Amino acid sequence: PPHGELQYLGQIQHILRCGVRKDDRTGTGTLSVFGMQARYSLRDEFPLLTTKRVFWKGVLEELLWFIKGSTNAKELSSKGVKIWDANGSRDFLDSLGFSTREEGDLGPVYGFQWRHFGAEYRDMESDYSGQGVDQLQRVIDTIKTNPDDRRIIMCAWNPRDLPLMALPPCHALCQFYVVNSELSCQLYQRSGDMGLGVPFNIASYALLTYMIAHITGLKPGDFIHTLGDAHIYLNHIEPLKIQLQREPRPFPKLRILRKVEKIDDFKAEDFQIEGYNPHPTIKMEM
Amino acid sequence: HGELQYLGQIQHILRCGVRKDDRTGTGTLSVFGMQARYSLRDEFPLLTTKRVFWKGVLEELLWFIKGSTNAKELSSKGVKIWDANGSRDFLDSLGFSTREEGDLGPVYGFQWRHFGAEYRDMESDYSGQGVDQLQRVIDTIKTNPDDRRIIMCAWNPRDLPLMALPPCHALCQFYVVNSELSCQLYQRSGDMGLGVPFNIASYALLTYMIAHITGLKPGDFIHTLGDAHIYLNHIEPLKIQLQREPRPFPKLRILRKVEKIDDFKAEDFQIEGYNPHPT
Ligand SMILES: Cc1nc(=O)c2cc(CN(C)c3ccc(C(=O)N[C@@H](CCC(=O)O)C(=O)O)s3)ccc2[nH]1
Ligand SMILES: Cc1nc(=O)c2cc(CN(C)c3ccc(C(=O)N[C@@H](CCC(=O)O)C(=O)O)s3)ccc2[nH]1
Ligand SMILES: O=c1ccn([C@H]2C[C@H](O)[C@@H](COP(=O)(O)O)O2)c(=O)[nH]1
Ligand SMILES: O=c1ccn([C@H]2C[C@H](O)[C@@H](COP(=O)(O)O)O2)c(=O)[nH]1
């Protein structure tokens, strides 16, 4: 049966052959296609792309940071993961008119929404215990008590809070689904940079699904990745063409090294990637 | 023929689907994660292999646009599709003893126009309260079409407990390139036999409406599904439907120049050449 990574690579080829020129904020331009979908089996494999190295450490720490409900980019940065620092910098915050906001304060993004949806956001260091809806926990409780449910959804898109965010969410929502003891996940990603973010994003939700499957006593199933604006930035075309030349190697496995009862208890040390043999990384700027 | 995609999806669920129970005890064949693409360029995707309830599509959309959450209002127009969820029994079953009959809570209309406002009842005044997502979409398409955030979201976790039915159409996104407006819908759960063809037509129509307001040509409608399923008692009738060769899609004519989305009326629309098979 074919390698799941051929779907992602298929999507790249499709955007190069059938994409349309489309401008963006940064003046760079993109080749863009609207509406794509790919399916990655999580059964005895983990979809961490091999044709280009994916920043695993960042995937893991960013997810743990989301789970804590943090929106402090400095916290994530302290762990050697710089992926949200440009958006939290004094410069970028001032350019959105957040002059009085502290450096690193990204607003009411992922962490805040997953745990405190609809609560009144003050600042990144504030107390929010019991405020808003804890979507992550509600998902977990529903999978345990009523797996056939077709409403197991986490949503980070909050129109009321948009004006306050440093970068409005790309993963607008995700849905879970359970059949024959297999947990699957679909992600609606409104906008996807195929060169940089998308492989990282695939790994984030693949990992989330492994985490929740473990908590709930289920086997990981599929991860479905659905895209809105799927695009390649023009200065990424050359490095992506190089990537298309490479034959994928087999996916690695993800081992979880102990029994964890609650999602808040997962630590980075609990996870181990086994057999990840990626080709040498190509720089893709942003 | 774009309808071959929908029919393709039916066949895929029959051949590859899995037996799965649901709220109603009926059981389903189910697949998680599907996507289909329907060209809106000089055609309108109203399915021909089984008749779609056009009048209901149109009136339901106009009702969403007004911001209405009153099932009795929709019902008054001969469209009974939300009546069971607005009935007194059902309302009491969810612990809404003091809510009036027809009041579905903060559903579609409310969210599209007043997202995050404090919902009191269906007849209340909400002028200027919350976020008007529909208008913001329209204003963004006009001023900054390249934007990748043109989104309308009906999924509001804070308001879920108050709704009679949680939304199927969690969100939709718009996209503009070369003067063509496209729409993608994330539908968490889709009954391929009944709702899905109706739902395809609703968002296809929305896209035609907004394209008209913004001066753009309709492009694609992308339909993305979470739990795509057929109920077990629909298998035999759907197999009959798969036998029928689809006929070309009809056209949608808009019969006057309308400047604002709130001004569209049912009389403004005309389906031209719709030749569906007998149900
Ligand atoms: C155009 C663009 N703008 C962004 O702000 C953006 C942000 C993210 C947020 N995010 C989730 C990530 C940002 C950066 C990642 C990353 O993998 N950084 C590695 C670089 C590895 C590489 O160059 O291939 C790193 O920190 O070194 S992952 C992802 C894609 C984006 N793409
Ligand atoms: C199993 C299921 N339960 C529901 O409650 C349900 C509700 C909707 C809400 N909705 C959006 C609609 C409800 C009814 C429609 C309809 O078009 N009825 C037609 C066709 C009748 C038929 O083919 O048997 C009609 O009454 O004329 S459209 C859609 C699918 C559902 N599917
Ligand atoms: O996790 C993420 C975060 C951001 N992006 C991308 C997509 C776009 O290229 C850009 C987002 O900016 P807007 O779409 O909001 O303009 O960064 C991703 O692909 N994945
Ligand atoms: O516009 C709609 C509304 C409802 N349904 C369906 C799918 C399910 O069969 C049922 C909803 O059940 P839940 O997923 O809410 O449990 O009605 C649709 O297909 N389209």
From Swiss-Prot, chain A:
Keywords: Cytoplasm, Disease variant, Dyskeratosis congenita, Isopeptide bond, Membrane, Methyltransferase, Mitochondrion, Mitochondrion inner membrane, Nucleotide biosynthesis, Nucleus, Phosphoprotein, Transferase, Ubl conjugation
Top-level taxonomic group: Eukaryota
Pathway field: Pyrimidine metabolism; dTTP biosynthesis
Record's catalysed reaction(s): dUMP + (6R)-5,10-methylene-5,6,7,8-tetrahydrofolate = 7,8-dihydrofolate + dTMP
Matches recorded under Pfam families: Thymidylat_synt
EC number assigned by the record: 2.1.1.45
Gene3D superfamilies on file: Thymidylate synthase/dCMP hydroxymethylase domain
Effect of Q135H: In DKCD; uncertain significance
Residues where Phosphoserine is found: S89
Residues given in the record as (6R)-5,10-methylene-5,6,7,8-tetrahydrofolate binding sites: D193
Protein location: Nucleus; Cytoplasm; Mitochondrion; Mitochondrion matrix
Active site: C170
CDD domains, alphabetized: TS_Pyrimidine_HMase
GO MF term list: folic acid binding; mRNA regulatory element binding translation repressor activity; sequence-specific mRNA binding; thymidylate synthase activity
BP terms from Gene Ontology: DNA biosynthetic process; dTMP biosynthetic process; dTTP biosynthetic process; methylation; negative regulation of translation; tetrahydrofolate interconversion
Disease: Dyskeratosis congenita, digenic: A form of dyskeratosis congenita, a rare multisystem disorder caused by defective telomere maintenance. It is characterized by progressive bone marrow failure, and the clinical triad of reticulated skin hyperpigmentation, nail dystrophy, and mucosal leukoplakia. Common but variable features include premature graying, aplastic anemia, low platelets, osteoporosis, pulmonary fibrosis, and liver fibrosis among others. Early mortality is often associated with bone marrow failure, infections, fatal pulmonary complications, or malignancy.
Family: Belongs to the thymidylate synthase family.
Subunit record text: Homodimer.
Protein known as: Thymidylate synthase
